[PDB]
Write a protein that binds this ligand. Structure first.
Ligand SMILES: [Cl-]
Length: 89
């Protein structure tokens, strides 16, 4: 079920970058740079992501077409208004 696996990875990570979650997720926001980017390694270590894959290359594949998040090099951010969310590390 690799297509379903990719969809579950996408939905879980798009949840972390939803406004509903970001409002309260200080740990995640303290890991952003000033552009909102944080390492995909951090996301890949979260328990719900580990429950789907331990292979970070499948995460990149699952997110390739996301309209919520944007991947640059090995980091990911929320696309919309990215500077609203970072917090002092
Ligand atoms: Cl885990």
């Amino acid at each position: 079920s690799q297509e379903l696996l990719k969809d579950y990875i996408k939905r879980q990570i798009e949840y972390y970058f939803s406004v509903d979650n970001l409002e309260r997720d200080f740990f995640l926001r303290r890991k952003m740079d000033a552009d909102g980017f944080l390492p995909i390694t951090l996301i890949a270590s979260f328990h719900r992501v580990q429950a789907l894959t331990t292979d970070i290359s499948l995460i990149f594949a699952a997110l390739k077409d996301s309209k919520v998040v944007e991947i640059v090099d090995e980091k990911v951010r929320r696309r919309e208004e990215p500077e609203k969310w970072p917090l002092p590390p």
